[PDB]
Symmetry: C7
Subunit: 188 residues, 7 copies
C-alpha cells in the first residue's frame, strides 16, 4: 500500500497511491462488487463532482462483477453527476463490471488490448446478501430485464440480442467488445 508525499504551502502531506490518483480524478473499481466497495466508489464520484463538476472522471475497471444492487448504485451515480465518467477496462469486466464499463460517457469507453468483457449475470449477483432478505423470482426477472435494457441502450444492440447473448457465460475479446458496442475504442 505505497504512499507518496507532496510538499505543499502548509507542510508535507502524505497520500496512499490510490488517494494520490484520486487527486487526478482517477477511480479504481477492482475486485468483486459488493455494498462496501460500491459505496466507496459512490463517495469518490460525489467528491470529484463537488471538487469540479466540469472535468471528466475516469473509472478503471478490473472486476469479475458481483452484487447487482451495489452495481446499480454506481450506475445511477455515474449517470446523475454532471461530469462525464470515462471507463477503461483493464484485465477483465464481468457481470455488473461489464455493465458499468458499457455505461461510461458515450465515446469515452475504452478497453486495453488483452482485456476481456462478459455481460453474463450469474444468479449469485441477484440473491439477498443479508441474512433476513430473500430475493424472489419475479424480482430477479425484473432486474435481469432492467439490466438488459441498460445494455441495449448503451451498446445500440437490440433488446432481443442482449437477452440472447447474456445467457452465455463467455468472454468477448477487447476487439469483439468494441464491435459489440460495449466500448468505443481499444487503446493500443
Amino acid at each position: 500500500v505505497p504512499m507518496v508525499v507532496e510538499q505543499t504551502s502548509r507542510g508535507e502531506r502524505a497520500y496512499d497511491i490510490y488517494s494520490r490518483l484520486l487527486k487526478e480524478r482517477l477511480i479504481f473499481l477492482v475486485g468483486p462488487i459488493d455494498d462496501h466497495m460500491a459505496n466507496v466508489i459512490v463517495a469518490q464520484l460525489l467528491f470529484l463532482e463537488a471538487d469540479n463538476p466540469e472535468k471528466d472522471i475516469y473509472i478503471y475497471i478490473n472486476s469479475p462483477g458481483g452484487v447487482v444492487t451495489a452495481g446499480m448504485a454506481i450506475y445511477d451515480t455515474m449517470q446523475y453527476i454532471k461530469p462525464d465518467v470515462s471507463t477503461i477496462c483493464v484485465g477483465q469486466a464481468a457481470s455488473m463490471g461489464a455493465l458499468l464499463l458499457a455505461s461510461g460517457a458515450a465515446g469515452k469507453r475504452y478497453a486495453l488490448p488483452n482485456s476481456r468483457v462478459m455481460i453474463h449475470q450469474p444468479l449469485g449477483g441477484f440473491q439477498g446478501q443479508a441474512t433476513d432478505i430473500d430475493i424472489h423470482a419475479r424480482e430477479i426477472l425484473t432486474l435481469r430485464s432492467r439490466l438488459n435494457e441498460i445494455l441495449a441502450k448503451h451498446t445500440g444492440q437490440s433488446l432481443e440480442t442482449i437477452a440472447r447473448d447474456t445467457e452465455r457465460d463467455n468472454f468477448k475479446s477487447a476487439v469483439d467488445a468494441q464491435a459489440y458496442g460495449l466500448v468505443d475504442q481499444v487503446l493500443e
Copy 2:
C-alpha cells in the same frame, strides 16, 4: 479507506454534512450515525444534513435511535436511497424531512420488517411476543405518518417481503422525488 494523512473519503464528505448509512443496521453503526448527526447540528444547526442510505435494514431499536435523533435535531435531514433500503433502512428513508426524500432511478425500497430485527441482540435479553407486536405497530404508525398512507395500508403491505421500484416508492409516499 481511501485516505490522506495529516481524511478518509467518508470523513471528507462529512465535512460537507453528508452521512453514509450503509450496510446492516446495528447498535455500533447506529451510534456512529447518531454521533455524526449531533456533531453536524452543533457545527451548524440551520444547514441541511444529508443521509445517503444503502442498507438491507437490521436491528429495530438501533434504527429507532437514528429515527429519534433525526426528528429531534434542528437541521432538516434529507434522505437519498442509493442501491436499496429495506426494513429499518426503508423506514429511515421515509422519515427524512418532508419534500427532501429522494430515490435514484434503479434503487429499490422494501418496508417489510423481518423477525430478526426484533430479537434480542444481547445474550441475556429475550424480546417477548408482546414487545414485538408493539414495535411492529409503532413502525407502521411511523410509516403511515410520513407516507400519508393509512394504518391498514402499511399494515397490509408490510407483510409482503417485496421491493418497490423508485417510481413506485415515490407514488407510495416513501420518497418525494426520483432524481433523474
Copy 3:
C-alpha cells in the same frame, strides 16, 4: 470505520475521531454491553471532564442492553462522586445496568427519546463471575440485587416493595411509562 473530524491548528492539522470530538463538548457515549473494559473508559472520561471543569454538566447518552453489575456500579459510583451534574439521555434502549445508570442521573436531568425503551430487570448473567477463577455466590447475588433495588427506589421515588416486585418482570417500559415511573424526568419530543 469511525469518522474523523480534523481541524487546522497553528502548525498543521489536528484530527479527532467523532467520539473524541463530542467528548470535547462533555458528551459521553455508553453504548453496547456493559463490561469492565467499557466501564473503565467511561470512568476515565468522567474524571477527565471533571478536572477540565468541575462545574459544568456532563452528558451520558445511553444505548445499552446492560451487562456486568460491578462494572455498572463503577460507573454509578463515579457519577455520584464527581462534582458535575451527570445528565443521562436514553437513546434506543436501556436495560438492567443501563436502566439503573439512566435512572441515576442528576435529578431533573434524566431524559428519554420518544421511541426509547427501559427495562429495569436484572438477569442472572450480570451477577456471575466474569473471571475464570471467580464464582459469585448466592448470598452476594441477593445482596447486590437488594442494593440495586434500593438505588432504583431512591432515584425513582418508588417504594422498595414496588421496585422489588416490578424488577421481576422482564418487560420494557415505553419512554412515557418510564417517565411516569420516575426512571426519567422528561421525554424529549
Copy 4:
C-alpha cells in the same frame, strides 16, 4: 473506544490521565499489564519523586508474581502510592489495594473486596514452568504476611479469612483494614 484528547500534542484518555499521575489497574493481572503499570510508576517517580501517585483498581486479580512486581515497585519508589477501589478488587488486586500508602487507601461505596487467592494465580503461566507445592505455600504465607502488615490484622486472622472466597462491602473492607476510607460525598 480508545478516545483521544489534544492538549497544549495528542493523547489517548488513559495517557492524558497519566499526565495527572493517575494509573489504571483494570482487568486480570498478568505479566503484560503488570509491567505496563511498573513502567508507569517508574515514569511518574522520575518526573516528580515528591508528588503522590494514584492507582485506580478494578480487577478480579490474577497472576501472583505479576502482582508482586507491582507491589515491590509501589513500595520502593519515593512517592506515596494512593489506591482507590472502583468496581471490585480480588486476590492480587485486593492485596495491591491494601498496600497503598497508609491513610491513602480508598474504596467507593459500591465497590467490593475479596482477599481470597485462588490456585490459578500461583500456577505457572509459561509452558515449561510447573510451580510446585512448597513454592505455593511459601507465596501464600508471604501474601498473608503482607496483608497482616498493611491491615493491622493478625497473621492468624488473615490465614483463616483468606480461605473464604467471599466479597466484603466497601464499609466492611474499611473496618477490616483493607482501605482507610470509603469515599462518599
Copy 5:
C-alpha cells in the same frame, strides 16, 4: 515491520526513484497496485524510465495481463530485473520489459510454464471454460514469441515443461537481454 526513511516506508521511498516491486503471487489486488504505480510514475514524468524488480512465482493470468497492457501503453520504457525467480506471469512480464532493458541476476531463474491454476476463475460465480483457456494460452505464447524472438511453436513446445532456466539460459533464450554481474 517495514522500515522507514526520512517520512516514507522503504517501498514508497524507492517509488520516488521510479522503482516498483512486483513480489509474491500475482493476483488482482497486487496487479492493480502495480498498475496504479505505473500510471502515477508516467504522469509524474512521462519520459524517465520505470523499473520493475520481479520476484514472483506467477499467478492469475488476467491480473498479469492488466500489468502487461499498462506497461505497453504508457510512454516510459519499463525496465525489468529478475531477482530471485520469475515464473509464469512473472516470467512473461520480465520478458515484456523495454527491449534492451531486461535484466536477470546471476542466480535468478525463469520458468515460462503457465499452470492451469492461473487460468481458472478466481470469483465464486465465474467458470473459465476450456476454449477461453486455450485462447489465453495461445495469446501468452504469442506475447513471449514477440518479445523473445523465438518462434510461436518453439514457445509452445518449451512452455509445456515446468522447468526453470538459469539466468544465462534465460538470456540466451531471449527472456532477458543481459545478466547483471
Copy 6:
C-alpha cells in the same frame, strides 16, 4: 493497551532514559528488539550505564545468548534488576549484568533451571540434537559459574532442580549483588 506520553509509548519514554524491559517469554523476536535497543543506547552514549529490568519465565536459549553476547560486548555497564521473576535464560541474563550492578526486588524469585523446551528447534526444518543440547547446557553452566562465583559442580547440581530461590537466597548464591529494600 500501552499508554502514551508526537506521542511516545511508555516503554519508548523509558528507553530515552536508558531503561530496557525484558518481559515475557524469550524468543527471537523480543531478543532482537533488545539487541537493537542495547546497540542504540551504546551508540547514543557509550559511557553511561544501561538498565535491563527483567520479568521473564525464560525461553529460547539461542535468543537469550544473543542478548548475553550483546550485553558483554558493548562498552556501557549493563545493570540488571529482577522484578517479579527470572527463570532459565531470564535468570542467566540477570546474573550476567555488570559486576556489582545486579539487583533483585524483595519479593522477586530466581530459577536457574533450564527446561528442555528452550533448547529444541523453533523452526519447522530444524531438529536440535542431543549432543548440541548437552553442549549448550554446559556453556550455560560455565556462564553461571563465572558470574556467580560458584563452582561448575555446584551450578550443575543446583540447575537440575526446578525450584525458585528467594531474592535473599539469590543474593547469597551470587546471582544478584544486592536486594533493593528502601
Copy 7:
C-alpha cells in the same frame, strides 16, 4: 517495537528502533527467510547503496534459514552493490542464513562468542512455496551444487569438503565456524 524520537527544526520525528539503526546502515536479517522478508532486505540494500555507495553496510543475522531462492535474491544483491556488506552472526545462522553470513565482504564476516552456524540445507528450502509450483529433483540438485560452490568460494574449503560436511545437520560453534572459513573473526572483546 520501541520508538526513538529525534528533534528536528519543526518539532519531533519518530523512528522505530530498526529504522533508526537503518539510518546508520544497519540491516537486521531475523527470522525465517522467505520472499517477503528477502525483498525488504533487498530494498534496504539498494537504498543504502544509493544513499552512499562508498560506506560499508552491515547485516546482523539471526535466522534458522528458509527459502533458497529468496536467500539467493539477497546474495545476488549483496554481491552486486558497490558497498562492502559486512555480516555479523548473532544467535544463530542456519542454511541460507549461514550462506549469507559466509558471503559477507572478505575480512568483514563476524560471529559473536555464543553464536552457532549450520550450513546444512534441508529439503524444505528447495520445495515450491506457491501452490502451482513443484520443484523437481534435478533443479534441487542444481541448486544444492550452486550453494556448495558459493560456500567453497567464500570459505576457501574444497568443493568436496563442503558437499560432505553439508549432509550433516550439526552446528559449528563461533570458534569452529571461524576456523572453517565461514566467518573471519569472533567478536570476543570490544577494542
